[PDB]
Tab-separated table of C-alpha atoms and ligand atoms in Angstrom:
chain	number	residue	atom	x	y	z
A	1	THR	CA	108.783	93.165	91.825
A	2	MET	CA	107.544	96.864	91.813
A	3	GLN	CA	109.042	98.907	94.493
A	4	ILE	CA	108.560	102.139	96.698
A	5	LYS	CA	111.484	104.099	97.668
A	6	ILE	CA	111.412	105.415	101.036
A	7	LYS	CA	113.294	108.300	102.585
A	8	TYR	CA	112.774	109.082	106.297
A	9	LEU	CA	112.993	112.535	108.040
A	10	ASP	CA	115.906	111.607	110.127
A	11	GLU	CA	117.812	108.568	111.820
A	12	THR	CA	115.458	108.551	114.740
A	13	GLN	CA	112.525	107.648	112.749
A	14	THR	CA	111.614	103.930	113.300
A	15	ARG	CA	112.118	102.190	110.017
A	16	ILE	CA	108.835	100.496	108.496
A	17	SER	CA	109.591	96.921	109.364
A	18	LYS	CA	109.430	94.098	106.705
A	19	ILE	CA	105.855	93.786	105.506
A	20	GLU	CA	103.724	91.128	105.328
A	21	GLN	CA	102.958	91.129	101.620
A	22	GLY	CA	99.618	92.358	100.595
A	23	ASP	CA	98.508	94.076	103.966
A	24	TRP	CA	98.046	97.765	104.671
A	25	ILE	CA	101.322	99.553	106.020
A	26	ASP	CA	101.319	101.259	109.472
A	27	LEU	CA	102.713	104.956	109.485
A	28	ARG	CA	104.191	106.383	112.892
A	29	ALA	CA	103.994	109.888	114.182
A	30	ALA	CA	107.330	111.512	113.876
A	31	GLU	CA	107.355	113.635	117.033
A	32	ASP	CA	105.005	114.041	120.144
A	33	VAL	CA	102.036	116.183	119.344
A	34	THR	CA	99.454	117.229	121.813
A	35	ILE	CA	96.054	118.355	120.629
A	36	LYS	CA	93.496	120.168	122.514
A	37	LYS	CA	89.725	119.149	122.377
A	38	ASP	CA	88.146	120.609	118.995
A	39	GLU	CA	91.255	121.422	117.737
A	40	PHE	CA	93.493	120.536	114.481
A	41	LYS	CA	97.053	119.536	114.039
A	42	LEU	CA	98.751	117.962	111.043
A	43	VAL	CA	100.710	115.187	112.212
A	44	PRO	CA	104.118	114.321	110.667
A	45	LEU	CA	104.902	110.846	109.789
A	46	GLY	CA	108.652	111.519	108.939
A	47	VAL	CA	108.532	109.568	105.569
A	48	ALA	CA	108.568	110.603	101.777
A	49	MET	CA	108.025	108.048	99.025
A	50	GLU	CA	108.546	107.579	95.434
A	51	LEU	CA	105.467	105.524	94.464
A	52	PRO	CA	105.598	102.874	91.598
A	53	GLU	CA	104.683	104.555	88.280
A	54	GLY	CA	100.858	104.919	87.685
A	55	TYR	CA	100.065	104.209	91.214
A	56	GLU	CA	98.807	106.414	94.222
A	57	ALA	CA	98.654	105.664	98.027
A	58	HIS	CA	95.615	105.914	100.239
A	59	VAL	CA	95.951	106.870	103.735
A	60	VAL	CA	93.416	106.017	106.449
A	61	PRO	CA	93.397	106.033	110.386
A	62	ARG	CA	93.807	102.394	112.030
A	63	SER	CA	91.036	100.698	113.602
A	64	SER	CA	92.194	101.680	116.928
A	65	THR	CA	93.178	105.348	116.186
A	66	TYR	CA	90.083	107.012	117.836
A	67	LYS	CA	89.769	104.580	120.716
A	68	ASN	CA	93.762	105.283	121.656
A	69	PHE	CA	94.033	108.981	120.349
A	70	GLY	CA	90.287	110.568	120.159
A	71	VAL	CA	91.324	111.963	116.754
A	72	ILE	CA	89.612	111.764	113.371
A	73	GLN	CA	91.177	112.440	109.996
A	74	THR	CA	89.662	115.644	108.468
A	75	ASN	CA	89.952	114.607	104.854
A	76	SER	CA	88.606	111.022	105.568
A	77	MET	CA	91.196	109.332	103.437
A	78	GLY	CA	94.382	110.939	102.162
A	79	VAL	CA	95.233	110.311	98.489
A	80	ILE	CA	99.065	110.796	97.562
A	81	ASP	CA	99.908	110.765	93.820
A	82	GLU	CA	102.894	109.060	92.346
A	83	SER	CA	104.033	112.793	91.511
A	84	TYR	CA	104.338	113.643	95.339
A	85	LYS	CA	108.065	111.919	95.086
A	86	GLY	CA	110.383	114.804	95.794
A	87	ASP	CA	113.221	114.921	98.386
A	88	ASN	CA	110.934	117.255	101.145
A	89	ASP	CA	107.509	115.664	100.016
A	90	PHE	CA	106.778	114.389	103.442
A	91	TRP	CA	103.439	112.653	104.668
A	92	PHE	CA	101.234	114.184	107.213
A	93	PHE	CA	97.990	113.002	109.236
A	94	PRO	CA	95.492	115.769	109.522
A	95	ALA	CA	94.097	115.051	113.104
A	96	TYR	CA	91.069	116.673	114.626
A	97	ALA	CA	90.941	116.013	118.168
A	98	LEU	CA	87.476	115.225	119.630
A	99	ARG	CA	88.792	115.313	123.150
A	100	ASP	CA	92.502	116.495	124.757
A	101	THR	CA	94.974	113.884	123.605
A	102	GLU	CA	98.691	113.225	123.481
A	103	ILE	CA	100.307	111.344	120.511
A	104	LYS	CA	103.807	109.994	121.147
A	105	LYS	CA	106.475	109.899	118.759
A	106	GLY	CA	106.466	106.412	117.251
A	107	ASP	CA	102.641	105.723	117.382
A	108	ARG	CA	101.288	103.648	114.618
A	109	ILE	CA	98.185	106.240	114.253
A	110	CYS	CA	97.504	105.448	110.292
A	111	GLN	CA	97.867	103.072	107.745
A	112	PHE	CA	98.311	103.056	103.933
A	113	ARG	CA	98.237	100.970	100.826
A	114	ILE	CA	99.021	101.698	97.068
A	115	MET	CA	96.353	101.297	94.289
A	116	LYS	CA	96.601	101.693	90.318
A	117	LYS	CA	95.392	105.069	89.537
A	118	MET	CA	92.006	105.200	87.654
A	119	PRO	CA	92.221	104.395	83.822
A	120	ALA	CA	92.278	107.538	81.598
A	121	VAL	CA	88.858	108.836	81.354
A	122	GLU	CA	87.227	111.410	78.882
A	123	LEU	CA	84.305	113.348	80.187
A	124	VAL	CA	82.014	114.416	77.398
A	125	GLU	CA	79.183	117.112	78.074
A	126	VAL	CA	75.632	116.141	77.140
A	127	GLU	CA	72.444	118.277	77.618
A	128	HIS	CA	70.369	115.607	79.073
A	129	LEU	CA	71.216	111.995	80.766
B	1	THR	CA	82.186	82.454	91.759
B	2	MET	CA	84.130	83.924	94.749
B	3	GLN	CA	82.820	82.856	97.854
B	4	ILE	CA	82.311	84.857	101.024
B	5	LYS	CA	81.587	82.585	104.105
B	6	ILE	CA	79.472	84.601	106.553
B	7	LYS	CA	78.606	83.672	110.082
B	8	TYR	CA	75.614	85.512	112.009
B	9	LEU	CA	75.721	86.441	115.598
B	10	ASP	CA	72.456	84.528	116.261
B	11	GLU	CA	69.104	83.426	114.602
B	12	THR	CA	67.690	86.863	115.252
B	13	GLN	CA	69.861	88.617	112.844
B	14	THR	CA	68.342	89.464	109.376
B	15	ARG	CA	70.147	87.698	106.673
B	16	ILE	CA	71.844	89.670	103.878
B	17	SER	CA	69.284	89.494	101.063
B	18	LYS	CA	70.467	87.933	97.553
B	19	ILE	CA	72.874	90.524	96.393
B	20	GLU	CA	72.796	92.458	92.849
B	21	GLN	CA	76.431	91.558	91.866
B	22	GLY	CA	78.874	94.320	91.960
B	23	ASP	CA	76.682	96.689	94.249
B	24	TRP	CA	78.059	97.575	97.692
B	25	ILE	CA	76.489	95.517	100.286
B	26	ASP	CA	74.460	96.786	103.214
B	27	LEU	CA	75.143	95.764	106.795
B	28	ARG	CA	72.820	95.782	109.820
B	29	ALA	CA	72.983	97.072	113.380
B	30	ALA	CA	72.695	93.790	115.349
B	31	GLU	CA	70.942	95.542	118.574
B	32	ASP	CA	69.520	98.691	119.638
B	33	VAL	CA	72.068	101.477	120.409
B	34	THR	CA	71.432	104.829	121.921
B	35	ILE	CA	74.253	107.355	121.664
B	36	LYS	CA	74.166	110.732	123.322
B	37	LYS	CA	75.472	113.889	121.555
B	38	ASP	CA	79.308	113.863	121.405
B	39	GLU	CA	79.816	110.331	122.631
B	40	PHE	CA	81.014	107.186	121.148
B	41	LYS	CA	79.802	103.615	120.666
B	42	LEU	CA	80.888	100.431	118.762
B	43	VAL	CA	77.650	99.232	116.729
B	44	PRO	CA	77.651	95.484	116.578
B	45	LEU	CA	76.833	94.393	113.086
B	46	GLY	CA	75.971	90.922	113.858
B	47	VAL	CA	78.459	89.235	111.415
B	48	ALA	CA	81.775	87.668	110.711
B	49	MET	CA	83.199	86.756	107.280
B	50	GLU	CA	85.890	84.749	105.490
B	51	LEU	CA	86.917	86.779	102.570
B	52	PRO	CA	88.276	85.305	99.505
B	53	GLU	CA	91.910	84.752	99.357
B	54	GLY	CA	94.213	87.789	98.674
B	55	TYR	CA	91.255	90.205	99.431
B	56	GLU	CA	90.295	92.769	101.890
B	57	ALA	CA	86.846	94.410	102.796
B	58	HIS	CA	86.163	98.077	102.960
B	59	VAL	CA	83.134	99.525	105.176
B	60	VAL	CA	81.799	103.199	104.844
B	61	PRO	CA	78.727	104.827	105.919
B	62	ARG	CA	75.759	104.788	103.923
B	63	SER	CA	74.944	108.030	102.176
B	64	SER	CA	71.677	108.427	104.387
B	65	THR	CA	73.517	107.565	107.518
B	66	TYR	CA	74.313	111.237	108.850
B	67	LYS	CA	70.916	112.377	107.998
B	68	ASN	CA	69.136	109.326	109.336
B	69	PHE	CA	71.210	108.770	112.524
B	70	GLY	CA	73.533	112.051	113.024
B	71	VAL	CA	76.734	109.666	113.086
B	72	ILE	CA	80.149	109.497	111.645
B	73	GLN	CA	82.529	106.490	111.194
B	74	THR	CA	85.513	107.635	113.431
B	75	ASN	CA	87.996	105.183	111.162
B	76	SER	CA	86.746	106.914	108.017
B	77	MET	CA	86.834	103.428	106.113
B	78	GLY	CA	87.228	100.286	108.029
B	79	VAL	CA	89.564	97.822	106.411
B	80	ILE	CA	88.964	94.053	107.118
B	81	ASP	CA	91.894	92.022	106.038
B	82	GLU	CA	91.500	88.293	104.793
B	83	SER	CA	92.939	87.376	108.002
B	84	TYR	CA	89.975	88.446	110.220
B	85	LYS	CA	88.011	85.267	109.564
B	86	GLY	CA	87.670	83.971	113.058
B	87	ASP	CA	84.621	82.297	114.670
B	88	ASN	CA	84.516	85.222	116.979
B	89	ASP	CA	85.707	87.847	114.685
B	90	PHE	CA	82.482	89.946	114.388
B	91	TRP	CA	82.372	93.215	112.603
B	92	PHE	CA	81.632	96.539	114.029
B	93	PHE	CA	80.676	100.260	113.019
B	94	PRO	CA	82.727	102.711	115.258
B	95	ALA	CA	80.005	105.504	115.656
B	96	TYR	CA	80.425	109.049	116.665
B	97	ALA	CA	77.246	110.980	117.348
B	98	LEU	CA	77.056	114.363	116.497
B	99	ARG	CA	73.769	114.814	118.129
B	100	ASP	CA	71.528	112.716	120.341
B	101	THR	CA	70.429	109.437	118.207
B	102	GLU	CA	68.865	105.891	118.639
B	103	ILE	CA	70.014	103.126	116.173
B	104	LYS	CA	67.579	100.496	115.863
B	105	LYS	CA	68.446	96.687	115.529
B	106	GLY	CA	67.987	96.004	111.721
B	107	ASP	CA	69.155	99.424	110.502
B	108	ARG	CA	71.230	99.630	107.262
B	109	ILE	CA	73.998	101.786	108.888
B	110	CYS	CA	76.891	101.064	106.556
B	111	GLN	CA	78.122	99.323	103.393
B	112	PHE	CA	80.931	97.129	102.075
B	113	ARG	CA	82.741	95.620	98.974
B	114	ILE	CA	85.823	93.504	98.485
B	115	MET	CA	88.818	94.320	96.788
B	116	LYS	CA	92.097	92.858	95.845
B	117	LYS	CA	94.904	93.571	98.216
B	118	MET	CA	97.973	95.547	97.087
B	119	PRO	CA	100.501	93.709	95.013
B	120	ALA	CA	104.033	92.590	95.876
B	121	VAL	CA	106.067	95.809	97.180
B	122	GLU	CA	109.637	96.093	97.890
B	123	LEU	CA	110.382	99.216	100.440
B	124	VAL	CA	113.974	100.384	99.774
B	125	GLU	CA	115.277	103.156	102.060
B	126	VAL	CA	117.095	105.925	100.162
B	127	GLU	CA	119.276	108.964	101.167
B	128	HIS	CA	117.466	111.247	98.675
B	129	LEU	CA	114.475	111.043	96.355
C	1	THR	CA	89.183	106.558	76.269
C	2	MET	CA	86.674	105.470	78.743
C	3	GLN	CA	83.680	107.731	78.010
C	4	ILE	CA	81.770	109.559	81.035
C	5	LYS	CA	78.785	111.590	79.924
C	6	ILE	CA	78.444	114.885	82.082
C	7	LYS	CA	75.294	117.158	82.466
C	8	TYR	CA	75.838	120.488	84.275
C	9	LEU	CA	73.166	122.254	86.427
C	10	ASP	CA	73.091	125.252	84.330
C	11	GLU	CA	75.421	127.439	82.134
C	12	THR	CA	77.235	129.076	85.205
C	13	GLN	CA	78.906	125.785	86.294
C	14	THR	CA	82.202	125.353	85.395
C	15	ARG	CA	83.149	122.903	82.832
C	16	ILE	CA	85.544	120.287	84.043
C	17	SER	CA	86.527	118.428	80.835
C	18	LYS	CA	90.368	118.420	80.123
C	19	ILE	CA	92.991	115.742	78.948
C	20	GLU	CA	92.841	113.518	81.903
C	21	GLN	CA	96.235	111.269	82.944
C	22	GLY	CA	94.526	109.335	86.006
C	23	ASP	CA	94.721	111.922	88.578
C	24	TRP	CA	91.619	112.558	90.645
C	25	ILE	CA	89.188	115.093	89.313
C	26	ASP	CA	88.060	118.079	91.349
C	27	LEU	CA	84.518	118.975	91.936
C	28	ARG	CA	83.025	122.412	92.726
C	29	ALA	CA	80.268	124.298	94.738
C	30	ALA	CA	77.234	124.998	92.304
C	31	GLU	CA	76.149	127.972	94.690
C	32	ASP	CA	77.203	129.397	97.861
C	33	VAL	CA	76.944	127.627	100.878
C	34	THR	CA	76.927	128.931	104.410
C	35	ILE	CA	77.287	126.684	107.245
C	36	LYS	CA	77.362	127.425	110.923
C	37	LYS	CA	79.500	125.505	113.454
C	38	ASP	CA	78.014	122.261	114.536
C	39	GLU	CA	75.776	122.374	111.334
C	40	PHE	CA	75.195	120.304	108.396
C	41	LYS	CA	74.611	121.038	104.539
C	42	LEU	CA	74.577	119.158	101.419
C	43	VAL	CA	76.724	120.979	98.946
C	44	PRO	CA	75.644	120.891	95.271
C	45	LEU	CA	78.527	120.098	92.919
C	46	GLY	CA	76.173	120.969	89.972
C	47	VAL	CA	77.150	118.118	87.894
C	48	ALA	CA	75.357	114.639	86.936
C	49	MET	CA	77.254	112.046	85.283
C	50	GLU	CA	76.938	108.533	83.285
C	51	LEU	CA	79.621	106.484	84.498
C	52	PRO	CA	81.074	103.524	82.462
C	53	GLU	CA	79.620	100.349	82.875
C	54	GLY	CA	80.597	98.187	85.625
C	55	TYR	CA	82.109	101.124	87.292
C	56	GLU	CA	81.522	103.263	90.528
C	57	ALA	CA	83.069	106.665	91.465
C	58	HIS	CA	84.516	107.566	94.864
C	59	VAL	CA	84.430	111.019	96.124
C	60	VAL	CA	86.527	112.292	99.105
C	61	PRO	CA	87.500	115.883	100.490
C	62	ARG	CA	90.339	117.555	99.036
C	63	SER	CA	93.724	117.548	101.091
C	64	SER	CA	93.089	121.538	101.706
C	65	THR	CA	89.371	121.198	102.269
C	66	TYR	CA	89.463	121.106	105.907
C	67	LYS	CA	92.214	124.100	106.404
C	68	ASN	CA	90.152	126.251	104.036
C	69	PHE	CA	86.629	125.608	105.072
C	70	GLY	CA	86.644	123.595	108.227
C	71	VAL	CA	84.178	121.148	106.975
C	72	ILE	CA	84.427	117.277	106.882
C	73	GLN	CA	82.607	114.801	104.734
C	74	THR	CA	79.994	112.843	106.963
C	75	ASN	CA	79.586	109.585	104.910
C	76	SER	CA	83.635	109.611	104.837
C	77	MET	CA	83.936	108.506	101.223
C	78	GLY	CA	80.824	109.022	98.736
C	79	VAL	CA	80.207	105.904	96.464
C	80	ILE	CA	78.235	106.803	93.281
C	81	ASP	CA	77.215	103.608	91.459
C	82	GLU	CA	76.952	103.222	87.748
C	83	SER	CA	72.989	103.065	88.362
C	84	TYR	CA	72.939	106.725	89.224
C	85	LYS	CA	72.995	107.882	85.815
C	86	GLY	CA	69.645	109.745	85.251
C	87	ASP	CA	68.731	113.430	84.463
C	88	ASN	CA	68.174	114.584	87.726
C	89	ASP	CA	70.944	112.583	89.632
C	90	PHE	CA	73.049	115.759	90.856
C	91	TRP	CA	76.069	115.136	92.895
C	92	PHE	CA	76.188	116.469	96.239
C	93	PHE	CA	79.167	116.833	99.119
C	94	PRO	CA	77.622	116.118	102.680
C	95	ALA	CA	79.299	118.798	104.841
C	96	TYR	CA	79.570	119.133	108.492
C	97	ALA	CA	80.971	122.180	109.723
C	98	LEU	CA	83.367	121.987	112.556
C	99	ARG	CA	83.276	126.113	112.471
C	100	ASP	CA	81.614	129.001	110.961
C	101	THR	CA	82.098	128.626	107.105
C	102	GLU	CA	81.366	129.932	103.921
C	103	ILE	CA	81.821	128.040	100.622
C	104	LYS	CA	81.608	130.043	97.630
C	105	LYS	CA	80.041	129.133	93.991
C	106	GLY	CA	82.880	127.667	92.098
C	107	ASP	CA	85.257	126.681	95.041
C	108	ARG	CA	86.785	123.374	94.500
C	109	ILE	CA	85.284	121.333	97.304
C	110	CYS	CA	86.144	117.787	96.751
C	111	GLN	CA	87.676	115.109	94.238
C	112	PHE	CA	86.669	111.803	92.614
C	113	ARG	CA	88.007	109.111	90.623
C	114	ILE	CA	86.485	105.939	89.166
C	115	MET	CA	86.928	102.399	89.930
C	116	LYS	CA	85.730	98.887	89.004
C	117	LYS	CA	82.906	97.550	90.805
C	118	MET	CA	83.754	94.525	92.925
C	119	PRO	CA	83.668	91.543	91.190
C	120	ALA	CA	80.657	88.877	91.682
C	121	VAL	CA	80.463	87.182	94.990
C	122	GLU	CA	78.469	84.433	96.325
C	123	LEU	CA	77.749	85.030	99.985
C	124	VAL	CA	77.327	81.348	101.934
C	125	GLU	CA	76.015	81.197	105.421
C	126	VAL	CA	77.919	78.964	107.724
C	127	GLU	CA	77.269	77.735	111.221
C	128	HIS	CA	80.936	78.424	112.278
C	129	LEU	CA	84.126	79.664	110.991
D	201	LIG	CL1	91.060	118.491	88.453
D	202	LIG	MG1	81.224	119.807	119.729
D	203	LIG	NA1	109.734	106.084	117.196
D	204	LIG	NA1	66.640	93.019	112.438
D	205	LIG	NA1	94.112	120.525	97.957
């Protein structure tokens, strides 16, 4: 079956456990991050990946992220292209804190799945619809 | 056709009307909810469902939700897996209010569609990409 | 390959036709938009589109949108059904400003892709799951 190659920041990153096929996959904070109310921090997830050809990954918060950490994801959903596959192309969670909050290294703060890229399209200008 | 089994919380919930196939499907607040500026409320949607095998649902705000209700969805997009199919597995909309607001029972406050879960993937750790 | 008809607000709008290979496609502010901290504005994108039959479009912010402009998208992810294909069906980015900001005419502000609508489903009410 088609594979994703994963490289981790260092040996202290908890490896993504064996997955239940089809499920979205959780991602972990790579270090402790403190964020003050109304402030923004790009949280490292200590992974870089080579996605299957023609695929992209979508990243959103876990259901309990707001409840547990009082952050929102500022891009709503991160889109990661197949091309973002290099040796230092690490993934981040863009968190805005709605209250004072502490995120612990290892905390499962967002989740991802892969999806085929959209079919090739051609956009054609018309004067009226 | 693929069947979605749906259970309503009680007799007073307005039933999901006959759908136009393909279109996202609107969901309604199960109760009146007051939310003060800068506070958070889980809004009951009054429904639990068994989705098609190999699928998941995605839930987002309706276009008019902010204008009408002054709230954002704190998880960005809700993911509901096929396995969330229990008699007690009700759906909620996690609302953060950017202003004082009152959501009324019946209000179509978000929408959902089903989508096939991601294919078989094999994560392989590598030293370098 | 799949055709999308595009109509622009006026001749000053930046045309976005190029050979596509499945990447998301960037949309741009149709005019200057100034938003104050804790205020909301619909940002015009200066485009109306006829999507391929059976398809919908999804819109999200760009990765750098928050960093550069300090706005979030209030609906999280915009959904644009194939049915929004009329001559005045212009596209908007619903922007909530977390700090004072200035979006300039021509600025890339968000990104879209298309996706096949969800297949036909039959919703069936049950007394219990
Ligand atoms: Cl582009
Ligand atoms: Mg505030
Ligand atoms: Na850890
Ligand atoms: Na009602
Ligand atoms: Na960007």
